[PDB]
Amino acid sequence: XXXXXXXXXXGXXXXXXXXXXXXXXXXXXXXXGX
């Protein structure tokens, strides 16, 4: 967590989603799974 609750649940932050790529950040973190 941290970073404003992971950017309010995937709203942004995390260094810009780690620069993007990476399969869309693992498909949006498992569609919100983790």
Spell out the SS3 assignment of 1-34: CCHHHHHHHHCCCHHHHHCCCHHHHHHHHHHHCC
Tokens for 24, please give them: 């869309």
Give the C-alpha separation, 19 to 22, whole Å.
9
The pair of three-digit structure tokens given for residue 23, joined into one six-digit string: 């399969």
Tokens for 19, please give them.
């620069």
Elucidation technique? X-ray
CA pair distance 34, 22, nearest whole angstrom: 15
Task: Answer for the pair 13, 4: CB distance below 8 angstroms, yes or no.
Answer: yes
What is the token pair recorded at 6?
A: 């992971």
